[PDB]
Amino acid sequence: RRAAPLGPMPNEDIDVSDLERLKKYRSFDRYRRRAEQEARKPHWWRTYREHFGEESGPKDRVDIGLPPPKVSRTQQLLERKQALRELRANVEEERAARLQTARIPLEAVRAEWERTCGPYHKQRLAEYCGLYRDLFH
Amino acid sequence: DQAAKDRLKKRIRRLEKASQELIPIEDFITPVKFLNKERQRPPVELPFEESERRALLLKRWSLYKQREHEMERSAIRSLLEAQEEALQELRLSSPELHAEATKRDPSLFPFERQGPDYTPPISDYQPPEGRYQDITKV
Amino acid sequence: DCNRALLTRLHRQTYARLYPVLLVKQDGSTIHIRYREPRRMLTMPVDLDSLSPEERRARFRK
Amino acid sequence: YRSKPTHGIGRYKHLVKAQVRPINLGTDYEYGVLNIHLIAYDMALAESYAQYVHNLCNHLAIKVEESYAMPTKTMEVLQLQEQGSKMFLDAVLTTHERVVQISGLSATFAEIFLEIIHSNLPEGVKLSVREHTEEDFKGRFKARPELEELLAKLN
Amino acid sequence: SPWRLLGALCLQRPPLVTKPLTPLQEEMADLLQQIEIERSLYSDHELRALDEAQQLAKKKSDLAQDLEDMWEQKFLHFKLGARLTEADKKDDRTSLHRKLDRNLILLVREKLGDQDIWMLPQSDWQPGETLRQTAERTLATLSENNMEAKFLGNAPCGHYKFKFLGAKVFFFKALLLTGDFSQAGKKGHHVWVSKEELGDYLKPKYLAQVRRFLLDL
Amino acid sequence: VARKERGWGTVWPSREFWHRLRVIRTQHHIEALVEHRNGQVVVSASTREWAIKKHLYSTRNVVACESVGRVLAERCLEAGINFMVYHPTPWEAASDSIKRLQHAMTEGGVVLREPRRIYE
Ligand SMILES: [Mg+2]
Numbered sequence: 001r002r003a004a005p006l007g008p009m010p011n012e013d014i015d016v017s018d019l020e021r022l023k024k025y026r027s028f029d030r031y032r033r034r035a036e037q038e039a040r041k042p043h044w045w046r047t048y049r050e051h052f053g054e055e056s057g058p059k060d061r062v063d064i065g066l067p068p069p070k071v072s073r074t075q076q077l078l079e080r081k082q083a084l085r086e087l088r089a090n091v092e093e094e095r096a097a098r099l100q101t102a103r104i105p106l107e108a109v110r111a112e113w114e115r116t117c118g119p120y121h122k123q124r125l126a127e128y129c130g131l132y133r134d135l136f137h
Numbered sequence: 138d139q140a141a142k143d144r145l146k147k148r149i150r151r152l153e154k155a156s157q158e159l160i161p162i163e164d165f166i167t168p169v170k171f172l173n174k175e176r177q178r179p180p181v182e183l184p185f186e187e188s189e190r191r192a193l194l195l196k197r198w199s200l201y202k203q204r205e206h207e208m209e210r211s212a213i214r215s216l217l218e219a220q221e222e223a224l225q226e227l228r229l230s231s232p233e234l235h236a237e238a239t240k241r242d243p244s245l246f247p248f249e250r251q252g253p254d255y256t257p258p259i260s261d262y263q264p265p266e267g268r269y270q271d272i273t274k275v
Numbered sequence: 276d277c278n279r280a281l282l283t284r285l286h287r288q289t290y291a292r293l294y295p296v297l298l299v300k301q302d303g304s305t306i307h308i309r310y311r312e313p314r315r316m317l318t319m320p321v322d323l324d325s326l327s328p329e330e331r332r333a334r335f336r337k
Numbered sequence: 338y339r340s341k342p343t344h345g346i347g348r349y350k351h352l353v354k355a356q357v358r359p360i361n362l363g364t365d366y367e368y369g370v371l372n373i374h375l376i377a378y379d380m381a382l383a384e385s386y387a388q389y390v391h392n393l394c395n396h397l398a399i400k401v402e403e404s405y406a407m408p409t410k411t412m413e414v415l416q417l418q419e420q421g422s423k424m425f426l427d428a429v430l431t432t433h434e435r436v437v438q439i440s441g442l443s444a445t446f447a448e449i450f451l452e453i454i455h456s457n458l459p460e461g462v463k464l465s466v467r468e469h470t471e472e473d474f475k476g477r478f479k480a481r482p483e484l485e486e487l488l489a490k491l492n
Numbered sequence: 493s494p495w496r497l498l499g500a501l502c503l504q505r506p507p508l509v510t511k512p513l514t515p516l517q518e519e520m521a522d523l524l525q526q527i528e529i530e531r532s533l534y535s536d537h538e539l540r541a542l543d544e545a546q547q548l549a550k551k552k553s554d555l556a557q558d559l560e561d562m563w564e565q566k567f568l569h570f571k572l573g574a575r576l577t578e579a580d581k582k583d584d585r586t587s588l589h590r591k592l593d594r595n596l597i598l599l600v601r602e603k604l605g606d607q608d609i610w611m612l613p614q615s616d617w618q619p620g621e622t623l624r625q626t627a628e629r630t631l632a633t634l635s636e637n638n639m640e641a642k643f644l645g646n647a648p649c650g651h652y653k654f655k656f657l658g659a660k661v662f663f664f665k666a667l668l669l670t671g672d673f674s675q676a677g678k679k680g681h682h683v684w685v686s687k688e689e690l691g692d693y694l695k696p697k698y699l700a701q702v703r704r705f706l707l708d709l
Numbered sequence: 710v711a712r713k714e715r716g717w718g719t720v721w722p723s724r725e726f727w728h729r730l731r732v733i734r735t736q737h738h739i740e741a742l743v744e745h746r747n748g749q750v751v752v753s754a755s756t757r758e759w760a761i762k763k764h765l766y767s768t769r770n771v772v773a774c775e776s777v778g779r780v781l782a783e784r785c786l787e788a789g790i791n792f793m794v795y796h797p798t799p800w801e802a803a804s805d806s807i808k809r810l811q812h813a814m815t816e817g818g819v820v821l822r823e824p825r826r827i828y829e
Contacts, residue, residue, distance in 0.1 A: 001340045009346070016351050020400060028798065040748070045343045053747070083763050093766045098192055102772040104764050106783060112760035121752065125788055128751055145491055152484055159477050160408045164380060164433065171289050174534035181530050191523060198520050205279075209453075210396075212708060216449055219705040223651035223662070224445065230495070230660060237622055238647045239364045241444040245645075248451065248466035252458035253277050253510045257592050259303030259573040266337070266417040267320020268424060273411050275480070276709050277510045279457045282520050283385035284528040292535035298378070298430075298461075303573060304508075306461035308378045310428075311535050313560070315567035317428055320416055337421070448645025452665075456595075456707050460510045 007044040064136070163274075285309075357440070357469065366444055370402055372473055373437040373454075374465035380433050382459055387435035390454065394439060397450065403438035407477060410434075438469065496659035499615040501627045502649065502702065503641065505668045505684065508592040509575055586683050588673060594686045595709060599693060600634075601681035610693055612702065614661065623648065627664045636678075640669035649705050652698045663702065710827045714746050722796035726823055730795040730814075732774075732807060739773050741781045741810075743793055752788050754781035774806035775813045782817025792823040 014022065025031055042057070087093065096102040113121075126132060183191075228235045285293075294313035299305045301321045308317070325333070338344060359369035373390060377383035387404065394401045414427035442450070451466065458464060467473060513521065541556035574580070578590050590596065602611050613634060617626040624646055631641050643666045650663035685693055687708055694700055713725045722729075728751060731742045740755040754777045755761070756768035765776055785791070801807055815821070 002344070003340055003342045005342045011348070011352065014352075019352075019354055021398075045346070049748075055747075080759065080763070087763065087766055090766075095189070097767050097770050097772055100771055102765075102776075104761070104776045104779065106779065109760040109764060109780060110783070112763075113758065116759055121784075124750060125752065128745065128749060142491075145487060148487055149484075152481070152487070157478055160479050162406055163409050164406060167289050171291065171533055174291075174539065175289070178533065194519055194523055197516060201516060209276075213449065213453060216452070216705050216707075219650060219701075220445055220449065220647070223648045226651040226653070226660070227648060227662065230497075234623065236364055238624075239444060240361075240366050240646055241368070241447065242624070242643065242646050244643070245447070245466075246468050248464075250455050250458065250464035250466075252462045252464070253460050253507050254304040254306050255297070255460060255510060256299075256305040256572045257303075257508050257575060257577065262303035264301045264318065264321050266322060266421070267427070268322040268415045268417075269320075270413045270415055271410070272413045272429070273409070276456050276707075277458060277460065277507065278513060278517060279459070280386045280389040281382065281459050281510075282517060282524060283381050284524045285381045285532075286384070288531075289533055292529060292532040292538060294535075297567070305572060306378075308430075308461065309381060310378075310430075312428065312537055313535075314428075314563045316563070316570060317414075317430075318416075320414065320427075322417075444645050445647045448647060448649075448665075451644055452707065455506065455667075456709060 010038070062136075359468075367441050368468075369441075370469045371439050371442070372465070372467050372469055373439065374407075374463075374467065375435045375437075376432060376463040376465065377435075377461060378430055378432055379461065380431075382462060383433045383435045386459055386462055387437060389457070390437050393450075393453065394437065397446070399442065399450075400440035401437065402440045403436075405436055405438070405477070407434035407436060494657045496657075497617070497619075498659060498661045499617060499623045499626045499630070500650075500661055500663045501613050501615070501631055502663050502665045502706070503598050503613070503631070503639075503668055504665065505588065505596040507594055511593045585685070585689075586676075586681075588671065588684055590684050591686055595707060596684040596686060597690060597706070599683050599685050599690070601683075610695065612663070612694075612699060623662055623664060627666065631666070635673075636680075637672060637674045639671040639673075642667040642669050650702065652701070654698065661698070663705075665705075713826045713829065715829075726794040728790060728793040728823070730793050730821075732797075732801075732810065734769075734774075734806070736769070738768055739777050741777050743781070743785065743790065751790065752781065752784045754778075754784060771806040771809055774810040778810035778813035779817055782814045782819040785819045786817065791819060793819065793821060794823050795821050 025034070093102070224235070224238075227238065291311055293309040293311050295307050296310045296314055296317050297305050298308045298310075298317045298319065300319040301324075310317070322330075357370045360367045375383050375387050375390070377386070391401060391404050409431050411429055411431045413429055415424045416427040417423060418425050455464065537556060537559075544555060575592070577592065581587075581590075584590065588596075598613060599610060600613055602609060613630060615626050615630040615634075617623070624643065627643070628641070631639055643664065648662045649665045650661075652661045652663075653659070683693075687703065687706065690706075691700075691703060694702065711727060713727065715725050717724060724746060726746060729744050729746075731744055733740045733742070738756040740753065740757065742753045743751040745751055756765070756773055756777060761776060761780060762768065765773055767773065785793075795811065797807060811821070
């Protein structure tokens with residue numbers, strides 16, 4: 001007895017005939033990337049996450065906080081491109097990169113991270129530690 | 138009379154049932170004369186300035202090759218788009234010419250060509266004398 | 276565009292030193308051949324193109 | 338399971354298939370396999386140009402059947418020295434053949450491809466574009482003296 | 493709607509000599525030669541030279557250069573051909589031997605009753621003929637000589653229309669193997685022309701798009 | 710004493726861990742994640758971030774991998790995580806960029822080889 005699938009099958013898109021004209025990936029890394037990309041999709045069959053607690057899947061989280069800083073995206077991108085171009089114009093930095101002797105000002109990196117994208121990392125780690133799961137629920 | 142022919146046919150079958158191995162290529166195999174010349178070779182000691190200029194030259198060469206590949210691909214794209222426009226126009230004009238043109242001439246089977254040379258040929262040039270012989274191994 | 280695939284070397288590990296000899300064929304044109312025994316020029320001869328009549332004519336002319 | 342809707346989700350043997358006469362139909366002239374021979378005295382130049390044409394075939398969606406090298410041919414130069422009546426060894430010249438075996442092509446793309454190839458020929462490299470025949474297939478193979486002598490005995 | 497049909501032939505002469513190297517390519521050639529000499533094992537000539545030089549040095553307390561000198565003097569005595577067969581002339585643009593590094597194409601001047609056109613060699617054929625054989629007949633007849641033309645493909649290369657009633661021109665590309673042009677002193681204005689001089693010469697918009705499928709090289 | 714996810718053995722990589730290091734080396738950027746067994750991201754260090762982007766040139770180099778590793782080790786020390794597992798491919802463990810990435814991670818205080826589970 002045969003039953004109809006409840007949705008699209010995984011490998012039903014590509015054509016079985018004329019396989020030699022279809023491009024292949026020759027990299028185990030490429031296949032791993034594709035497999036992990038597919039494994040995160042909400043499949044219609046019984047998957048691993050449903051049985052092992054994806055925490056109710058999607059959750060509409062109530063946001064109680066200050067509005068994000070309104071930054072001019074065009075001017076920010078222009079300034080970032082100019083800074084990158086000025087860094088690229090230097091020849092000593094290229095020499096250091098080629099010779100594998102280059103250092104980073106970790107203090108300035110940490111300061112900039114806290115200024116621009118530190119809040120998101122802190123929020124996600126507080127999710128992971130369950131601060132909001134017990135403070136506001 | 139007949140037994141000899143039977144033995145001959147049996148030797149056909151036995152020899153044709155064997156393998157069809159290729160000739161070993163002398164390029165991919167290293168002759169024995171190249172083993173005695175390795176230990177004496179002195180290193181070269183690339184200096185820092187030479188390494189730097191070589192790295193810069195490789196970067197420039199990579200950029201130049203990328204741009205040259207892009208230009209060649211653009212040229213072949215222009216050729217192909219002109220050709221497909223030509224084919225579409227001819228198909229719109231007449232189908233019999235399209236059928237005739239979408240074949241190939243039997244004259245293109247033995248296509249032979251030679252590349253350019255370093256010096257143009259010299260008119261009235263006389264090679265004096267000399268004989269050719271094959272020393273290739275069987 | 277004739278200088279596209281010219282800028283290459285021997286991609287092998289063990290190989291003898293070879294030199295850019297100038298080879299001229301039976302036409303008046305020359306090419307560059309990477310070859311040992313660093314002679315500055317090599318010439319291609321001919322004694323087998325023509326038949327007996329032209330061979331005798333060339334022998335008499337020489 | 339067979340009755341479950343998820344049957345055949347693990348089917349993979351249909352995704353990989355791992356267990357020539359020209360097709361001349363007039364308008365879709367998808368002919369047979371062809372040998373591109375590259376003959377050169379410079380081994381490095383021949384290898385470089387074979388690599389270039391192989392990469393061009395790969396980029397142009399051309400099904401490259403093979404990319405091989407034919408046995409070398411070592412010509413020996415015997416030059417007649419001055420005053421004549423002699424013959425001395427001048428040099429040895431080893432000619433090398435690199436052949437790219439392509440599967441299928443059209444008249445239009447064959448014209449464009451050949452145009453690109455003879456525009457990008459290096460110096461001192463002989464081009465050849467032929468159809469794959471039994472003689473071209475047996476060129477890579479050694480002679481069969483036992484077979485030839487028996488056939489002589491037959492005849 | 494009346495239709496006029498016409499073929500045309502773009503004859504390309506392969507370059508006889510290789511183009512010169514860009515200084516970047518010259519630097520890369522020097523680098524490749526140096527690294528090949530470095531990675532190279534030994535040559536018999538240099539091995540014999542070093543062995544003989546050491547042997548004389550040690551025997552003095554108790555050839556290769558001659559052969560090199562002989563090769564050098566033979567090379568200096570031998571003189572190659574002139575690569576620049578046009579720089580000395582600077583006059584004849586109609587010679588087949590004009591340029592040796594670039595591809596050349598033929599342009600022939602025709603002055604008709606109502607048109608004075610610097611025209612690429614066109615043709616005419618009745619519906620019982622084929623475009624390819626028409627091009628072959630045109631190169632055999634209108635060129636008044638014996639050429640050996642190698643056609644690349646049966647399929648066309650260029651297609652252009654003009655409506656007055658309309659007419660169509662189909663350009664096929666052919667290659668020159670060996671030609672013996674007779675009567676070079678004729679009044680028929682036939683010119684061998686390169687890419688840039690072709691752009692300089694060809695006025696009309698229809699013939700200005702031959703460069704679209706012609707190789708720039 | 711937490712329950713490590715023992716199991717598969719047939720597929721790769723083994724999912725018996727509490728935290729895992731995952732290095733993604735695209736053709737442009739380099740991104741190092743620390744992931745929990747459920748798949749969420751704990752701490753990440755990316756060359757796409759402006760802090761490393763404006764301080765580092767040519768974000769694809771071995772020096773880029775080393776800088777990303779140092780930043781990730783510092784962030785892990787801030788986050789209070791000290792043990793994680795790294796399971797590279799055989800051709801990835803022999804590379805120069807990720808060997809120095811591991812060296813920088815070890816020198817930054819983060820030690821691999823997550824401790825054995827008590828009463829496993
Ligand atoms: Mg932005």
